Amino acid sequence: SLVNRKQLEKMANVRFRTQEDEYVAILDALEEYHNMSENTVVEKYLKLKDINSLTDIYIDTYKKSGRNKALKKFKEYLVTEVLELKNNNLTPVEKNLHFVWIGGQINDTAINYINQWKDVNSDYNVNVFYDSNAFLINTLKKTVVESAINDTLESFRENLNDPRFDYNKFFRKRMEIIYDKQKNFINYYKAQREENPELIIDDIVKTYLSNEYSKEIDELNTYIEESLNKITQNSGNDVRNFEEFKNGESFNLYEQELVERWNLAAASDILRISALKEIGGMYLDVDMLPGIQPDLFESIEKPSSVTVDFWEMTKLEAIMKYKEYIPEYTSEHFDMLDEEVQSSFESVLASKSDKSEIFSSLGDMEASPLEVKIAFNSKGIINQGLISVKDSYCSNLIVKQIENRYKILNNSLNPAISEDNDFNTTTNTFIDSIMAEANADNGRFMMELGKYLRVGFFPDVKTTINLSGPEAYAAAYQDLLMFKEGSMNIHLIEADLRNFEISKTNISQSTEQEMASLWSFDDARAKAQFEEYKRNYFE
Ligand SMILES: O=c1ccn([C@@H]2O[C@H](COP(=O)(O)OP(=O)(O)O)[C@@H](O)[C@H]2O)c(=O)[nH]1
Ligand SMILES: OC[C@H]1CN[C@H](O)[C@@H](O)[C@@H]1O
Ligand SMILES: [Mn+2]
């Protein structure tokens, strides 16, 4: 409970020192805060913000004041009061589950995962967000990348047996060709948009694919039809009917990632937070599954011979092996267990008849109007799981973080692209500008932007997490606890972030599909795909 006016007067007391206007401003504001019983949680937080600002105004005005020590202690009590305000005043979470699949046909694997959530949360409305205008982005990315592969491997033909022509050389040379093909498409998209602003993304994409890659417009229309029909009868919710998002400051960023960068994870990052802000509820990646009942595998001890991650995977594999809720779910990890351990799993699952005995239900959830709750793995916070009440204060802060982060990026990126040079020259101008504009505040953030042009086309490029992903969420939490906006220097520790954790029992994160990233890939996969592309091209 935050100190009252009398308690602060005692802390900041200085014998025979004038009560300065700036000091009385603080005391008045603190007194007002303690008479705000019947005000909203956000109103109370905005008051605590004022009190913090007024306290800073004082310490800045009277630099050598005997009050300053006690006022620095008071600024700490304000932060504790934000957390107490967040933990003790909770409203219901709107019973919505938000999924996103944009850029192409939703796979049966995605639907089968979504259906688990539906079966165990019959009291929840389910939105599977799609873009009715952009069903051909994934077909465009795949066509350009496969053509870039063939163009690269052909350039390798003779100097092939040479170990200098490794997987690293392949991806560097292929990137140059992907960039040229990207620029060609973006230039066509813009040309078509000035000629006829009525044309939608899929109109332009399918005409581009007909012109440049001899694709049949009739086949592409059939694919759109089948994809639109499929999502239509799986709780489909059209982005092109989401007016608040379309009229907002983030839609140009969403289309930047959808249309120019072909990064559907980045576009998903921008959409999911808008959905939570405007509607409220819980966002889940299509690779997440419901929480396993805590008591289910209580009786089965984890072998020392197996990692924590291995064990969490085998739990889901066990369920799917014996209940077959998701057809052709892997048993790769379960099948490595000793027969006695496999038997323990079978015997437990044989004693369960209903899915509600395997997976838990979200039920009535409540959160602070201040907060967006976020999922955790061993590496820290991850936006694959998000809970927020409609129009939460943090949902607003996170939108503003993403918008500010893209402003800094585009400011350095757009000049470089406008010079209309090759990938290396463009990369060089971009990084020069990044390092030029970097300061003490945004230094760390700027050092992560360098690979933006390569996202999805080159191994171990994770730029998106700094722009639209987890780092935006960490920054938004810092904004809340520091009574400010626009944090770039993240100094929060685990203990701070853990106040915003989603309970581990609400999501099963260790799924088969979670282990296969859709927008990034590591060295292991790079090496593997290179060899796969080589034997395919020369047989
Ligand atoms: O073609 C795509 C690829 C990805 N996504 C979205 O991107 C999210 C994150 O993808 P993934 O789980 O592969 O990211 P990771 O967990 O590997 O960071 C998914 O849940 C989808 O909402 C999409 O809509 N279309
Ligand atoms: O921010 C980009 C991705 C980071 N990993 C998350 O699981 C995924 O949901 C995001 O799209
Ligand atoms: Mn994932």
Author numbering: 2 to 540
From the primary publication:
TcdA and TcdB contain domains that use UDP-glucose to glucosylate and inactivate host Rho GTPases, resulting in cytoskeletal changes causing cell rounding and loss of intestinal integrity.
The geometry of UDP, isofagomine and noeuromycin bound to TcdB-GTD was established by solving the crystal structures. However, the ion-pair interaction distance between the nitrogen cation of noeuromycin and the β-phosphate oxygen is slightly weaker at 2.7 Å. The C2-hydroxyl of the noeuromycin also interacts (3.0 Å) with a β-phosphate of the UDP. Despite the extra interaction of the noeuromycin C2-hydroxyl, the combination of this interaction and the weaker nitrogen cation to UDP interaction together caused reduced inhibition potency when compared to isofagomine. With UDP, isofagomine and noeuromycin gave KD = 0.067 ± 0.019 µM and a KD = 0.180 ± 0.070 µM respectively. Movement of the loop from residues Gln510 to Asp523 (10 Å) towards the binding pocket occurs on inhibitor binding and is highlighted with the black arrow.
